[PDB]
Swiss-Prot record:
The lineage of its organism: Eukaryota, Metazoa, Chordata, Craniata, Vertebrata. This is Mitogen-activated protein kinase 10. The TXY motif contains the threonine and tyrosine residues whose phosphorylation activates the MAP kinases. Weakly autophosphorylated on threonine and tyrosine residues in vitro. Palmitoylation regulates subcellular location and axonal development. The keyword Transferase applies. It catalyses: L-seryl-[protein] + ATP = O-phospho-L-seryl-[protein] + ADP + H(+); L-threonyl-[protein] + ATP = O-phospho-L-threonyl-[protein] + ADP + H(+). It is linked to A chromosomal aberration involving MAPK10 has been found in a single patient with pharmacoresistant epileptic encephalopathy. Translocation t(Y;4)(q11.2;q21) which causes MAPK10 truncation. One of its GO terms (cellular component) is nucleus.
């Protein structure tokens, strides 16, 4: 047989024999993931077993979308698909899908805990922006960027793991309040991640959206009439009846005490970093900085290389299907 089975991290992995010494490296709702040695390629890989891809239409659509996009997209800051397989021989027996990807060293949740380094932080932010720019050019607007679905190598090279559309702390006001969104909906999420790299605290924590919104207005201030008028009347009423906050200024939100101190370079960078935060963490998306403009910001633009930023977009998600239909769709996709 060309497969073998091993129990790993309380799941059964049935994989190609090329893949050896499977070790659990974590899990998500999307599936459980192992590190493995690929004997054919002489390199370590990550293997994801999709957890109950057919349990419902939501799972199926996500699995199909992930598979097709990860195949189509080829960018250095988006995780790339190395191989895909199922151990089952027929569509009727078809049950499991295995994704093989490059093995990364850590997700951002770990890196975020490290002591702030301007070189590191600006480089990570630059790469996130490059990945997001590339997704957007393909019509992919993520809406759920968060530290746990962003991964990095020991050398600080960074890749986004998924394609978006449970932790809700990184979601934009227009998403929370149901206003509709544009491309810079993803910039708010970057801003939350950056704010967290600085404070080592979740910016907008909260048991629920009510709690979350309170943290937003307490720190950033009650939004302007311009913004209010763009809300549904019914939503408008709740938001307007909250206590009015003047925002904390960004110097108070992100004081000098949180940044490397006592050199000229360090003074320079703290102010630049705060300026960028001030442009990303903007409640009204009409006033929030774009991806392209963020890449031009002095804090970010030191890393700018046209060959990384200006890559051609891929040339390829509203249709519904039965679970049986999605299954055949996924199967043919697996069989290439
Ligand atoms: C908080 C620190 N994180 C950490 O130490 N690790 C996570 C990432 C991991 N590397 C990897 N490399 C490739 C992939 I694809 C995935 C991965 C994809 N989906 C996941 C879901 C949960 C955990 C890991 C993954 N993960 C190494 C171990
Ligand atoms: Cl809620």
């Amino acid at each position: 047989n060309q497969f073998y089975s091993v129990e790993v991290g309380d799941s059964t992995f049935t994989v190609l024999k090329r893949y050896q010494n499977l070790k659990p490296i974590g899990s998500g709702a999307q599936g459980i993931v192992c590190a493995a040695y690929d004997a054919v390629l002489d390199r370590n890989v990550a293997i994801k077993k999709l957890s109950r891809p057919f349990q419902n239409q939501t799972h199926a659509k996500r699995a199909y979308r992930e598979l097709v996009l990860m195949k189509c997209v080829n960018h250095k800051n988006i995780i790339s698909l190395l191989n895909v397989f199922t151990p089952q021989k027929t569509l009727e027996e078809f049950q499991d899908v295995y994704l093989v990807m490059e093995l990364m060293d850590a997700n951002l949740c770990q890196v975020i805990q490290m002591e702030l380094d301007h070189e590191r932080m600006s480089y990570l932010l630059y790469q996130m922006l490059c990945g997001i720019k590339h997704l957007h050019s393909a019509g992919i607007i993520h809406r759920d960027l968060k530290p746990s679905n962003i991964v990095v190598k020991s050398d600080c090279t960074l890749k986004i793991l998924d394609f978006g559309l449970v932790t809700r702390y990184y979601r934009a006001p227009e998403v929370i309040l149901g206003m509709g969104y544009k491309e810079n909906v993803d910039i708010w999420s970057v801003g939350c991640i950056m704010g967290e790299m600085v404070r080592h605290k979740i910016l907008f924590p909260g048991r629920d959206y009510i709690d979350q919104w309170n943290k937003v207005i307490e720190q950033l201030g009650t939004p302007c009439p311009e913004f209010m008028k763009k809300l549904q009347p019914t939503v408008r009423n709740y938001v307007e009846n909250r206590p009015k906050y003047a925002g904390l200024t960004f110097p108070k939100l992100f004081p000098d005490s949180l940044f490397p101190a006592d050199s000229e370079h360090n003074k320079l960078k703290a102010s630049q970093a705060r300026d960028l935060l001030s442009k990303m963490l903007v409640i009204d998306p009409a006033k929030r900085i774009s991806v392209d403009d963020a890449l031009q910001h002095p804090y970010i633009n030191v890393w700018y290389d046209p060959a990384e930023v200006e890559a051609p977009p891929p040339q390829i998600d509203e249709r519904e299907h039965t679970i049986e239909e999605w299954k055949e769709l996924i199967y043919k996709e697996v069989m290439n």
